[PDB]
Amino acid sequence: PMPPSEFLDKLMGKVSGYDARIRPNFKGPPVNVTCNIFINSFGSIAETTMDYRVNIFLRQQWNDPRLAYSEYPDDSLDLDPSMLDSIWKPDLFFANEKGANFHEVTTDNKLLRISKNGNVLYSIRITLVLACPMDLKNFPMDVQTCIMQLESFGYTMNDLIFEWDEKGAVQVADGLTLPQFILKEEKDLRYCTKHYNTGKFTCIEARFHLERQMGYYLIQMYIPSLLIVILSWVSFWINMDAAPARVGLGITTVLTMTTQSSGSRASLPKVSYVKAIDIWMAVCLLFVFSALLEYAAVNFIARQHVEEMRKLFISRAKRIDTVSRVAFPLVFLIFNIFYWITYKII
Amino acid sequence: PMPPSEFLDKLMGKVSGYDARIRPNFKGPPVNVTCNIFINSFGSIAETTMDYRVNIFLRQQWNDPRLAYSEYPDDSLDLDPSMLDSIWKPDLFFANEKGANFHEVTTDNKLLRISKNGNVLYSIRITLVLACPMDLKNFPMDVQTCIMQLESFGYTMNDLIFEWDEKGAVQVADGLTLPQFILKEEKDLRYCTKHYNTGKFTCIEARFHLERQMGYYLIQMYIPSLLIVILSWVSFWINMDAAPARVGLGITTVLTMTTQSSGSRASLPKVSYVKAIDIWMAVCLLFVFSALLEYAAVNFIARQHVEEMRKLFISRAKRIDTVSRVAFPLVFLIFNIFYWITYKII
Amino acid sequence: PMPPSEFLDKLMGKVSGYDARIRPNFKGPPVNVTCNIFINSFGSIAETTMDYRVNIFLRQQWNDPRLAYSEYPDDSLDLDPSMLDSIWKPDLFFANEKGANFHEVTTDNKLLRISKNGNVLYSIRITLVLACPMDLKNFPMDVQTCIMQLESFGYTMNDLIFEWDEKGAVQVADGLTLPQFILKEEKDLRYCTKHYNTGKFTCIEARFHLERQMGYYLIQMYIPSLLIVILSWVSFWINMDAAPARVGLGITTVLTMTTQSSGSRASLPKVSYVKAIDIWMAVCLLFVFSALLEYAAVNFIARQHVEEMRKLFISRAKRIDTVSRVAFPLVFLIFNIFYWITYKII
Amino acid sequence: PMPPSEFLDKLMGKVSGYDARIRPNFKGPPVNVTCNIFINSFGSIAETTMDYRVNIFLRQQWNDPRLAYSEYPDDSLDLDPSMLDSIWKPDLFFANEKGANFHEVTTDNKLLRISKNGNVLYSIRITLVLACPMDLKNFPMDVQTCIMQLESFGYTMNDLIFEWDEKGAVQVADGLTLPQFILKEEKDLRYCTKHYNTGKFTCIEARFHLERQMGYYLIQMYIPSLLIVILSWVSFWINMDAAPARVGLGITTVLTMTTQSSGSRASLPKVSYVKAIDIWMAVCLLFVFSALLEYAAVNFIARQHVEEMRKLFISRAKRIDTVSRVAFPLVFLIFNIFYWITYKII
Amino acid sequence: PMPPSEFLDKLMGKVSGYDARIRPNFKGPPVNVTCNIFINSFGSIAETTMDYRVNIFLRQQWNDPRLAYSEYPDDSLDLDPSMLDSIWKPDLFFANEKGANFHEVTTDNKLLRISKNGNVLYSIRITLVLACPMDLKNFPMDVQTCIMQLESFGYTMNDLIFEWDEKGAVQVADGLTLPQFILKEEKDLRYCTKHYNTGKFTCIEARFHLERQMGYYLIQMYIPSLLIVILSWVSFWINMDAAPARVGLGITTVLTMTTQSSGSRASLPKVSYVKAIDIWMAVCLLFVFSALLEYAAVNFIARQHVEEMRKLFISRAKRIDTVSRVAFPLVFLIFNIFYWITYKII
Ligand SMILES: *[C@@H]1O[C@H](CO)[C@@H](O[C@@H]2O[C@H](CO)[C@@H](O[C@@H]3O[C@H](CO)[C@@H](O)[C@H](O)[C@@H]3O)[C@H](O)[C@H]2NC(C)=O)[C@H](O)[C@H]1NC(C)=O
Ligand SMILES: *[C@@H]1O[C@H](CO)[C@@H](O[C@@H]2O[C@H](CO)[C@@H](O[C@@H]3O[C@H](CO)[C@@H](O)[C@H](O)[C@@H]3O)[C@H](O)[C@H]2NC(C)=O)[C@H](O)[C@H]1NC(C)=O
Ligand SMILES: *[C@@H]1O[C@H](CO)[C@@H](O[C@@H]2O[C@H](CO)[C@@H](O[C@@H]3O[C@H](CO)[C@@H](O)[C@H](O)[C@@H]3O)[C@H](O)[C@H]2NC(C)=O)[C@H](O)[C@H]1NC(C)=O
Ligand SMILES: *[C@@H]1O[C@H](CO)[C@@H](O[C@@H]2O[C@H](CO)[C@@H](O[C@@H]3O[C@H](CO)[C@@H](O)[C@H](O)[C@@H]3O)[C@H](O)[C@H]2NC(C)=O)[C@H](O)[C@H]1NC(C)=O
Ligand SMILES: *[C@@H]1O[C@H](CO)[C@@H](O[C@@H]2O[C@H](CO)[C@@H](O[C@@H]3O[C@H](CO)[C@@H](O)[C@H](O)[C@@H]3O)[C@H](O)[C@H]2NC(C)=O)[C@H](O)[C@H]1NC(C)=O
């Protein structure tokens, strides 16, 4: 019995009229190529460039009546990547590649096996940096949706159709974890058939639903932002005579809030719409700014006040100081309730 | 009937006298190659390097009488990229490439179809990082103009001419959005015929009109810059006796403005001309600096003042403090009006 | 006697029925390829991307009865990399490559020698940037575990099996030092046999146990963080009359702690769980914040106090100031003991 | 008449004894290759790495008697880059490449035309990142000199000589602008013949004279640095009784100057020699530091002063305060004159 | 006479029994390849990654009796890089490459000349980014030692030996300058013969002795660090009554020192051992911290003091203030002497 390598010479060579530039079922129905990808290393989701690097295994299955054999006993011939370049392959590509490369560490990472009926399996390893438009209207409580479409370039709809398989469409690794986001078990599968001036091409896309973990931003940009507001609340228990103490407290705490507000947009795009973290840095900046105007009103009334007028303005400048100890801890409290509840049902 | 792959062997091979190193219509009129590009992924417009990464589909159409066939029934032969390297192709390149590469994810992204009359369509996917000179005289209210020219390298004007098609010259994707800029529907199409020491070559360019969204810079560099000026206005309601309070307020607020003025040029080139944001950081720095000189004049008059001279300087040092509460909120207001109106018609 | 180069022509050529696309022992037992790697340049372990660049020498040994010779006297034929591409090689790859390349400086860094019995040695140089999931629950006192698996891509378990050799499995260079971590002499060797929808493949992995050196973080984020707490302890020896002195001391030292707490996450991922350095920056921030509330209580009691009530509140506002000089230096001391002991046995 | 493509087969092929590995005029005079470059995209001049990226068109002209034809009517044959690799080309390279690549966007950007007398034109597009040693003794008022040399590698002086053409040696694009530097119209052309242990090789270099635009650094590091000195001058109009006001003014303004002095070396190499901007940040730091020692002398004399000694020290502590209002605004003024004049003739 | 190109066909072709896969002097003594490198562009020595980019010319000389000719008159045949790939070349590589590439700007930068006796010169251009372990025990006064070893990969000691030439081993360019380090004229040449599990290979290395220039760090991290200590010395000339002045001076100057101490490790690895700059930032931080405790002791004694006890504590609180004006300027002076002398002989 001749080995499978010499058997491919009589099937892939110039004999039998088999050419690698002809699609199967020519002058007939289009080729239905089913695909299923396996995610190996997901993560590294940048926000300034709005892209994410993923390493998937692209599997392609299509029927080819020209490769059907009957003399070989087994129904699986794991060939060599050398014969892989001498056959026909679908022109599958991604519309959001933005730079990609293969992996040829000691061997071109390609798979090729042919069944008796003509089934051809084609599995390779591709590293992609896919771009996805993100909506940052509520940045700390956003639901990301990273999509990836698989289009055709040379073959139109009447010559090649891409579809998803029924069982096991998108497999996920067991020990695949993410530091910031989380990968939900629900993945939508829809069509993305485009229409250009040349024609229409097939397209299959998968929608990965992600969600950020608030455990990181809560400690960096929320807990320190909440303590600065408390630093302005303590400015009311000090007597009005200590002018350099209360003025310096109302200024040193209002400028460090602007620094944290300006520094909270380091790893963020320059979007125009306001997000959920910008209003938090803005409203909390208003409370520490209102504390400055609070003492300014108390100081102006105290310095404006023979014995009948001064006996009432002192009681007025002190009464407003007692209300401020209950007003701001309650106005900021009702805002803290209306903030997390509004961003919990949207 | 022989397949189209074997038919190309009798048309692209050594037979019929067809060579891939000869342009169509040799020793006659030049080749008129019409082009139309489709934008897939636009964005990532850097400002320090003054470049932007774009992913376009370069389509080229040219007539070739040597490829006219009459035996094949259909008028479209979607060939393989293997035969694409055995024919003649225009030497189209960009004068502002600055690094570029193709996309060969599982298939070389090339398109080739030949009609009966000799029409040859050539569509590929090219990722370009194009450089464009930007005028930042008014950075927050600028109108960017990103151009891209398509020149010839080996064929002069009398051998190859590039032109734009009539219908559908520059197609834009439907879901193409930008975080900072906006892509207008008006795209100019002009010629850029260059003249070197070797000769003259064809050139076609498209002018993309962009515009920044002020919604981002208004919240980061304008709202905090406006609140610092208010921190200097509150220094007038405090009595002149509180020297460590008003001095510290006039210094802690004037130095944080310089930090924001120096930190507002992070993602900006080192241009010499002054922009619209530099004068805003400069004039607002003058207001918070004038508040320091305002108290310095009040403190100097108060410390200079038997009972006839001291009874008038106290009334003078207090009258100037009452005018400053109306002067600066009005001088800064008329400047705020003359600022946004001047940069709204230019 | 013919040279070994011409002898390979009669062994690797079309004669003798030897093809490079057939694995040894075909239609029989699988090939048992033993591997052992040598680490040349280890280090550069990034934390934001969670990867590390390593340069190893991949040695592969497998038997091949088709290469057994008997005419050559010696038992070692150091061939040329040209003949290396004309033989069969295992399809070894890594599941966490994330970009890799070879080294061809003046010569393709490949090794190939064939023994008389059929032993084939294959040594090459590969530069890998391997990703590893890290658990940062206790960042300054963590025990890293960098793993690297060697899987098969085209050959299943019944066709190719990877195993580790007995003596000298993972060799380490003599002068291999690390600036941050340390490489322990204990390296675990286990199996990682995966199961996909196509089939099962062999897998061998090595677990490198690393450990950070606390000598760096102790000086940057611990010693300065401990001195700031002492700056708040000195606020008790100052009299209560100095309001601008004690207030400014309690605010200038509590805001610089937040800056160090926010700046301590520069080269750190955005993980949600709290680490050992976040609680240190949080508890120490509570001590410098409690010093602010300490003086606020003393100032409020002093300003609230004919001669019977004022004679007791002054003694009360001074007694609490004497307890604070012993309380905080002891509450922070017992926390400093419970901190390093808890992170010394876990 | 045979086409020019088939005519090259009888001239570039094995016939006529023409080989691509033999230089013209063998066993005789050396080849005189004249070169002229065209600058397309200049700029991106980094300062930390001391390099600049340039995109030039390298044109090469040399005579070759083996390519002289007499049957073709025209005197220009624009060939294909395929025949370009089958002829002899000079081994021109740059001694300061530091990474380079070609441009093959849809066509290898190469030019090849042969005249009747034997003139061969060779124009290509090369992107170079050239390194140049810069002298930063006066950084804001420096005159940069970026050089680029074209050496030979395999052919010595007696086999190949590089020279510049007479008319149009270095052409510059019309719309070529720079954000920081300026390209002068004077470009020196000299020789750089090197002598190694192997032999001597030809070399041609061009000296591009650049000059920075002070309009950028004047607004960022000079105007804010001048206002801080004024903040220390206002410390003299305040009474000596305001100790927390004048001390805080002399310290908050002297520490922000050190921050600007340390932050003014971000995009700068770590050179040892002092530059023109370091002395400006040093002398201006001395003025704001002398203001601290000025009040320290006034405060020490005021606190040292039955009625005869105190009546003179108060007049002395006030007289020195009046001289400081004229001394420092004049000592800093004469330094400001001696600074810009010294760096205007050197 | 036949040209040298056609003469190589009778020497490098299949005739004469010359094969490119056989080393010279087979079945005999090993090949002694002498090497000498020329440094073109040295510098760019990173500290975080601990590597440096160098551009050297790798020259290799070895005897080959199979290339000896007698018919050609001259003794030098400068061949083409095409024939360079058809001969035998040593398998020279570097053990610390970490990414490398060649230079093929318009020509593969290779040199090949063969003498009559059989001497073969091989010169190429290689760009290397070499890693070197650095000892930063005394960072500002360190003596760097960058090494680079040239090992063999396929040929053992008994088949190929690398050695350095006698005259002109390591040539240095004339205009080669460095911004930070300096290249000494003393370069050690030793052997680095390694022993692996496969065998022993030749190795030659050169030790480049470097030294940093203190002129940069003296102005950025030493002069500003020395002025901050003077800001704490001036806190003694102010009266003890000015509590908000001396407290604010002792805190604003002690926190900016921590910022400079934390910011002095930007371009530095995360090593555990303490360096010479860390102790300078630590001891100087102790002086500005001792000034805070100095006033705390004076303030506590002043606030503790019918007329007999208060008449002595005031004289005691003032006497300690006079000693502090001589103590700290002398304790810091003797430390400044013991610092530069200790790091001048080690
Ligand atoms: C690839 O999949 C498509 C469907 O997604 C297959 O096409 C449809 O194929 C049928 C033949 O099986 C075509 O004929 C029709 O048959 C149905 C009964 O199955 C009958 O009810 C209809 O009236 C019609 O006669 C049908 O036109 C075709 N439709 C389309 C839109 O293509 C296709 O055959 C598959 N290709 C291969 C190679 O299997
Ligand atoms: C490519 O397009 C150019 C025009 O952009 C074509 O060229 C012009 O072509 C005409 C022939 O169609 C040349 O002849 C002239 O004909 C006109 C009538 O159409 C007549 O009024 C003139 O007096 C003249 O006889 C004309 O010289 C030529 N002009 C130029 C500037 O090239 C060209 O033919 C097109 N090429 C192909 C292959 O179609
Ligand atoms: C590669 O290694 C495997 C083991 O890891 C070898 O396989 C085992 O090989 C034996 C033959 O040596 C097979 O037969 C059995 O022999 C044992 C005695 O050694 C006997 O007790 C059993 O009842 C059985 O008859 C055995 O089935 C096989 N097992 C597996 C799981 O593969 C294999 O032969 C090695 N390959 C080469 C080419 O050396
Ligand atoms: C390339 O250019 C060089 C000059 O840069 C040419 O070389 C010089 O060429 C002349 C022949 O033209 C050699 O001969 C001499 O002729 C002059 C009159 O022109 C005569 O006064 C001298 O006494 C001598 O007989 C001369 O030796 C040579 N000099 C050098 C330094 O090379 C060269 O011919 C040019 N190559 C080609 C291929 O055109
Ligand atoms: C490459 O260099 C080595 C030395 O580094 C050469 O090897 C030594 O070569 C000599 C022959 O010249 C061998 O023989 C001996 O000769 C000496 C007199 O020179 C004699 O005193 C000894 O008793 C012995 O007979 C010697 O064994 C050998 N040693 C080693 C360690 O290799 C070698 O010949 C050079 N290769 C070529 C191709 O020139």
Side-chain angles (χ1 to χ4, degrees), chain E residues 279-280 330-343:
Chain E
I279 57 177
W280 179 267
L330 265 59
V331 176
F332 183 80
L333 189 144
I334 60 179
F335 172 79
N336 190 27
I337 297 181
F338 293 157
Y339 183 82
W340 300 109
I341 295 183
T342 305
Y343 289 93

Side-chain angles (χ1 to χ4, degrees), chain A residues 175-184 187-194:
Chain A
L176 179 60
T177 59
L178 300 181
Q180 308 178 12
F181 303 86
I182 50 180
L183 184 59
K184 300 179 60 180
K187 301 179 180 60
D188 298 332
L189 301 176
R190 58 184 61 179
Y191 295 91
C192 35
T193 300
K194 304 300 180 59

Side-chain angles (χ1 to χ4, degrees), chain E residues 100-103 105-107 109-117:
Chain E
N101 48 14
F102 292 91
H103 296 269
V105 178
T106 320
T107 292
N109 294 337
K110 301 179 180 300
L111 181 59
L112 178 63
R113 55 180 60 182
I114 304 177
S115 300
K116 299 181 61 180
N117 48 17

